[PDB]
């Protein structure tokens, strides 16, 4: 792939790393709306997005680009901020590993 998109590659398994376990852990995965009792979840989030989905995408090279990536990661995010109250132990966690996204990305060579 472009060196961009390499990067990226790297940035997810960082964010993979057990270092960010402790707060990066709900990410992993799809959110499990059945095991987790959301019924509103699907309709309140029209695009979910995690870090095993994101990995997928890198793994098959469906990224265009770096700002693609990115889109996606600010997604999983996104879905987090929007969905729950503001002061939810998960929208600490996402903070954490977002500062951890964010810092990566930025660093990032043009």
Not at 44 to 72: N, V
Request: glycine share 2%; aromatic share 12%; with cysteine.
């Amino acid at each position: 792939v472009s060196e961009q998109l390499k990067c990226c590659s790297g940035i997810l398994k960082e964010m993979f790393a057990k270092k960010h376990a402790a707060y990066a852990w709900p990410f992993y995965k799809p959110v499990d709306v059945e095991a987790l009792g959301l019924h509103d979840y699907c309709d309140i989030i029209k695009h979910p997005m995690d870090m095993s989905t994101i990995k997928s995408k890198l793994e098959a090279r469906e990224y265009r680009d770096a700002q693609e990536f990115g889109a996606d990661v600010r997604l999983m995010f996104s879905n987090c901020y929007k969905y729950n109250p503001p002061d939810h132990e998960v929208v600490a966690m996402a903070r954490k590993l977002q500062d951890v996204f964010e810092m990566r990305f930025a660093k990032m060579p043009d």
